Symmetry: C3
Subunit: 87 residues, 3 copies
Protein backbone atom coordinates (compact mmCIF):
# COMPACT_ATOMS: atom_id res chain seq x y z
CA UNK A 1 0.00 0.00 0.00
CA UNK A 2 1.54 3.37 -1.17
CA UNK A 3 2.06 6.24 1.38
CA UNK A 4 1.63 10.02 0.70
CA UNK A 5 2.25 13.51 2.19
CA UNK A 6 0.72 16.88 1.08
CA UNK A 7 1.38 20.66 1.60
CA UNK A 8 -0.24 23.84 0.06
CA UNK A 9 0.37 27.67 -0.07
CA UNK A 10 -1.67 30.76 -1.14
CA UNK A 11 -5.46 30.71 -1.91
CA UNK A 12 -5.52 29.63 -5.66
CA UNK A 13 -4.10 27.32 -4.36
CA UNK A 14 -0.73 25.60 -5.08
CA UNK A 15 -0.63 21.90 -3.89
CA UNK A 16 2.29 19.38 -3.82
CA UNK A 17 1.66 15.60 -3.14
CA UNK A 18 4.61 13.17 -2.50
CA UNK A 19 4.09 9.35 -2.95
CA UNK A 20 6.41 6.51 -1.72
CA UNK A 21 5.80 3.46 -4.02
CA UNK A 22 8.12 0.34 -3.99
CA UNK A 23 11.06 2.36 -2.53
CA UNK A 24 10.81 5.54 -4.74
CA UNK A 25 9.17 8.99 -3.98
CA UNK A 26 7.72 11.15 -6.87
CA UNK A 27 5.94 14.59 -6.88
CA UNK A 28 2.59 15.75 -8.42
CA UNK A 29 1.83 19.55 -8.69
CA UNK A 30 -1.37 21.70 -8.94
CA UNK A 31 -1.26 25.52 -9.62
CA UNK A 32 -4.94 26.15 -10.63
CA UNK A 33 -5.26 24.26 -14.00
CA UNK A 34 -4.52 20.47 -14.11
CA UNK A 35 -2.08 18.11 -12.27
CA UNK A 36 1.51 17.68 -13.70
CA UNK A 37 4.77 15.90 -12.59
CA UNK A 38 7.38 17.78 -10.48
CA UNK A 39 11.22 17.62 -10.27
CA UNK A 40 11.36 15.64 -6.93
CA UNK A 41 12.46 11.98 -7.51
CA UNK A 42 14.49 10.27 -4.68
CA UNK A 43 14.56 6.90 -2.82
CA UNK A 44 12.28 6.23 0.23
CA UNK A 45 9.68 3.79 1.70
CA UNK A 46 8.15 6.64 3.88
CA UNK A 47 7.71 10.47 3.39
CA UNK A 48 6.54 13.65 5.22
CA UNK A 49 6.55 17.33 4.07
CA UNK A 50 6.22 20.95 5.33
CA UNK A 51 6.42 24.37 3.55
CA UNK A 52 6.59 28.13 4.48
CA UNK A 53 6.66 31.49 2.56
CA UNK A 54 9.26 34.32 3.02
CA UNK A 55 7.22 37.16 1.50
CA UNK A 56 5.97 35.40 -1.71
CA UNK A 57 8.96 32.93 -2.11
CA UNK A 58 8.16 29.21 -1.34
CA UNK A 59 10.48 26.88 0.69
CA UNK A 60 9.75 23.06 0.82
CA UNK A 61 11.38 20.38 3.08
CA UNK A 62 10.77 16.63 2.25
CA UNK A 63 11.76 14.03 4.94
CA UNK A 64 12.46 10.71 3.08
CA UNK A 65 13.12 7.50 5.14
CA UNK A 66 14.62 4.10 4.02
CA UNK A 67 14.85 1.66 6.99
CA UNK A 68 16.04 3.86 9.95
CA UNK A 69 17.90 6.47 7.73
CA UNK A 70 16.04 9.81 7.06
CA UNK A 71 17.36 12.33 4.42
CA UNK A 72 16.02 15.96 4.27
CA UNK A 73 15.57 17.45 0.73
CA UNK A 74 15.34 21.28 0.31
CA UNK A 75 13.54 23.39 -2.38
CA UNK A 76 14.50 27.13 -2.11
CA UNK A 77 13.68 28.39 -5.67
CA UNK A 78 16.34 26.52 -7.78
CA UNK A 79 16.13 22.66 -7.71
CA UNK A 80 16.44 20.18 -4.75
CA UNK A 81 19.58 19.80 -2.51
CA UNK A 82 20.27 17.74 0.68
CA UNK A 83 19.74 19.40 4.10
CA UNK A 84 21.61 19.07 7.44
CA UNK A 85 18.78 17.16 9.30
CA UNK A 86 19.94 14.13 11.40
CA UNK A 87 17.83 12.01 13.86
Amino acid sequence: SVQTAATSWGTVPSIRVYTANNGKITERCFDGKGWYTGAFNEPGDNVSVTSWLVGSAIHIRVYASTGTTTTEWCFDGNGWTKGAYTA
Copy 2:
Protein backbone atom coordinates in the same frame (compact mmCIF):
# COMPACT_ATOMS: atom_id res chain seq x y z
CA UNK B 1 -2.23 -0.62 13.03
CA UNK B 2 -4.01 2.80 12.53
CA UNK B 3 -2.57 5.78 10.53
CA UNK B 4 -3.62 9.46 11.08
CA UNK B 5 -3.33 12.94 9.44
CA UNK B 6 -4.19 16.38 10.99
CA UNK B 7 -4.81 20.01 9.82
CA UNK B 8 -5.80 23.26 11.71
CA UNK B 9 -6.88 26.88 10.95
CA UNK B 10 -7.47 30.22 12.81
CA UNK B 11 -6.54 30.94 16.49
CA UNK B 12 -9.36 29.16 18.50
CA UNK B 13 -8.37 26.84 16.90
CA UNK B 14 -10.34 24.51 14.56
CA UNK B 15 -8.77 20.99 14.16
CA UNK B 16 -9.62 18.01 11.86
CA UNK B 17 -8.02 14.53 12.49
CA UNK B 18 -8.41 11.71 9.84
CA UNK B 19 -7.86 8.04 10.93
CA UNK B 20 -7.41 4.96 8.64
CA UNK B 21 -8.66 1.97 10.76
CA UNK B 22 -10.10 -1.39 9.48
CA UNK B 23 -10.22 -0.24 5.78
CA UNK B 24 -12.10 3.09 6.45
CA UNK B 25 -10.90 6.73 6.99
CA UNK B 26 -13.14 8.62 9.55
CA UNK B 27 -12.99 12.30 10.75
CA UNK B 28 -13.01 13.90 14.27
CA UNK B 29 -13.57 17.70 14.65
CA UNK B 30 -12.75 20.43 17.27
CA UNK B 31 -13.97 24.11 17.13
CA UNK B 32 -13.30 25.23 20.77
CA UNK B 33 -15.62 23.01 22.94
CA UNK B 34 -15.49 19.14 22.64
CA UNK B 35 -14.59 16.58 19.89
CA UNK B 36 -17.44 15.36 17.57
CA UNK B 37 -17.60 13.06 14.44
CA UNK B 38 -17.39 14.73 10.97
CA UNK B 39 -19.08 13.87 7.60
CA UNK B 40 -15.91 12.38 5.94
CA UNK B 41 -16.12 8.53 5.69
CA UNK B 42 -14.40 6.84 2.66
CA UNK B 43 -12.23 3.73 1.93
CA UNK B 44 -8.45 3.84 2.73
CA UNK B 45 -5.44 2.12 4.44
CA UNK B 46 -3.26 5.37 4.33
CA UNK B 47 -4.19 9.16 4.57
CA UNK B 48 -2.59 12.66 4.15
CA UNK B 49 -4.32 16.12 4.37
CA UNK B 50 -3.78 19.88 3.65
CA UNK B 51 -6.14 22.95 3.98
CA UNK B 52 -6.30 26.74 3.19
CA UNK B 53 -8.63 29.59 4.43
CA UNK B 54 -10.75 31.79 2.06
CA UNK B 55 -11.76 34.47 4.63
CA UNK B 56 -13.49 32.42 7.41
CA UNK B 57 -14.32 29.54 4.93
CA UNK B 58 -12.05 26.40 5.11
CA UNK B 59 -11.10 24.29 2.02
CA UNK B 60 -9.78 20.70 2.71
CA UNK B 61 -8.10 18.10 0.41
CA UNK B 62 -7.77 14.48 1.75
CA UNK B 63 -5.54 11.92 -0.10
CA UNK B 64 -6.81 8.32 0.58
CA UNK B 65 -4.57 5.36 -0.53
CA UNK B 66 -5.42 1.60 -0.88
CA UNK B 67 -2.70 -0.44 -2.72
CA UNK B 68 -1.42 1.74 -5.65
CA UNK B 69 -4.78 3.68 -5.90
CA UNK B 70 -4.84 7.26 -4.39
CA UNK B 71 -8.24 9.13 -4.46
CA UNK B 72 -8.40 12.91 -3.61
CA UNK B 73 -11.55 14.09 -1.69
CA UNK B 74 -12.57 17.82 -1.66
CA UNK B 75 -14.46 19.94 0.97
CA UNK B 76 -15.37 23.51 -0.22
CA UNK B 77 -18.35 24.35 2.11
CA UNK B 78 -21.05 21.84 0.92
CA UNK B 79 -20.05 18.16 1.57
CA UNK B 80 -17.28 15.98 -0.02
CA UNK B 81 -16.69 15.23 -3.79
CA UNK B 82 -13.88 13.28 -5.63
CA UNK B 83 -11.00 15.39 -7.06
CA UNK B 84 -9.05 15.32 -10.38
CA UNK B 85 -5.78 14.09 -8.66
CA UNK B 86 -3.84 11.14 -10.25
CA UNK B 87 -0.29 9.80 -9.47
CA UNK B 88 2.79 9.75 -11.85
Copy 3:
Protein backbone atom coordinates in the same frame (compact mmCIF):
# COMPACT_ATOMS: atom_id res chain seq x y z
CA UNK C 1 11.43 1.03 9.27
CA UNK C 2 10.76 4.57 10.71
CA UNK C 3 7.73 6.89 10.06
CA UNK C 4 8.00 10.75 10.37
CA UNK C 5 5.74 13.85 10.52
CA UNK C 6 6.76 17.55 10.13
CA UNK C 7 5.42 21.10 10.90
CA UNK C 8 6.95 24.62 10.40
CA UNK C 9 6.14 28.31 11.25
CA UNK C 10 7.42 31.91 10.71
CA UNK C 11 10.54 33.16 8.81
CA UNK C 12 13.30 32.15 11.37
CA UNK C 13 12.47 29.62 10.02
CA UNK C 14 11.32 27.09 12.75
CA UNK C 15 10.84 23.32 11.96
CA UNK C 16 9.81 20.30 14.15
CA UNK C 17 10.26 16.64 12.90
CA UNK C 18 8.73 13.67 14.87
CA UNK C 19 10.08 10.07 14.29
CA UNK C 20 8.32 6.79 15.32
CA UNK C 21 10.95 3.98 15.79
CA UNK C 22 10.33 0.61 17.59
CA UNK C 23 7.23 2.05 19.39
CA UNK C 24 8.80 5.37 20.63
CA UNK C 25 8.42 8.95 19.15
CA UNK C 26 11.28 11.54 19.54
CA UNK C 27 11.49 15.22 18.35
CA UNK C 28 14.27 17.16 16.47
CA UNK C 29 14.22 21.03 16.38
CA UNK C 30 15.53 23.73 13.93
CA UNK C 31 15.51 27.52 14.79
CA UNK C 32 18.00 29.01 12.26
CA UNK C 33 21.39 27.54 13.40
CA UNK C 34 21.59 23.68 13.47
CA UNK C 35 19.29 20.84 14.70
CA UNK C 36 18.85 20.04 18.46
CA UNK C 37 16.74 17.44 20.41
CA UNK C 38 13.34 18.68 21.77
CA UNK C 39 11.32 17.79 24.93
CA UNK C 40 8.66 15.49 23.27
CA UNK C 41 9.34 11.75 24.02
CA UNK C 42 6.23 9.45 24.21
CA UNK C 43 5.07 5.99 22.94
CA UNK C 44 3.85 5.49 19.29
CA UNK C 45 4.20 3.37 16.08
CA UNK C 46 2.47 6.12 13.94
CA UNK C 47 2.65 9.97 14.23
CA UNK C 48 0.90 13.06 12.72
CA UNK C 49 1.24 16.76 13.71
CA UNK C 50 -0.38 20.20 13.18
CA UNK C 51 0.39 23.69 14.64
CA UNK C 52 -1.05 27.28 14.74
CA UNK C 53 0.22 30.71 15.99
CA UNK C 54 -1.40 32.98 18.64
CA UNK C 55 0.41 36.24 17.85
CA UNK C 56 4.00 34.92 17.31
CA UNK C 57 3.65 32.02 19.87
CA UNK C 58 3.44 28.40 18.53
CA UNK C 59 0.88 25.74 19.66
CA UNK C 60 1.51 22.06 18.59
CA UNK C 61 -0.78 18.96 18.64
CA UNK C 62 0.94 15.52 18.06
CA UNK C 63 -1.33 12.44 17.38
CA UNK C 64 0.60 9.34 18.64
CA UNK C 65 -0.87 5.89 17.66
CA UNK C 66 -0.01 2.52 19.33
CA UNK C 67 -2.15 -0.23 17.70
CA UNK C 68 -5.74 1.20 17.53
CA UNK C 69 -5.22 3.71 20.46
CA UNK C 70 -4.51 7.40 19.48
CA UNK C 71 -3.39 9.87 22.24
CA UNK C 72 -3.22 13.68 21.56
CA UNK C 73 -0.20 15.54 23.12
CA UNK C 74 -0.39 19.38 23.63
CA UNK C 75 2.36 22.09 23.65
CA UNK C 76 1.13 25.66 24.55
CA UNK C 77 4.41 27.37 25.71
CA UNK C 78 5.52 25.26 28.75
CA UNK C 79 5.85 21.42 28.38
CA UNK C 80 3.56 18.66 26.92
CA UNK C 81 0.21 17.53 28.51
CA UNK C 82 -2.31 14.87 27.25
CA UNK C 83 -5.34 16.26 25.29
CA UNK C 84 -9.11 15.45 25.24
CA UNK C 85 -8.99 13.82 21.71
CA UNK C 86 -10.74 10.42 21.19
CA UNK C 87 -11.47 8.53 17.88
CA UNK C 88 -14.90 7.65 16.29
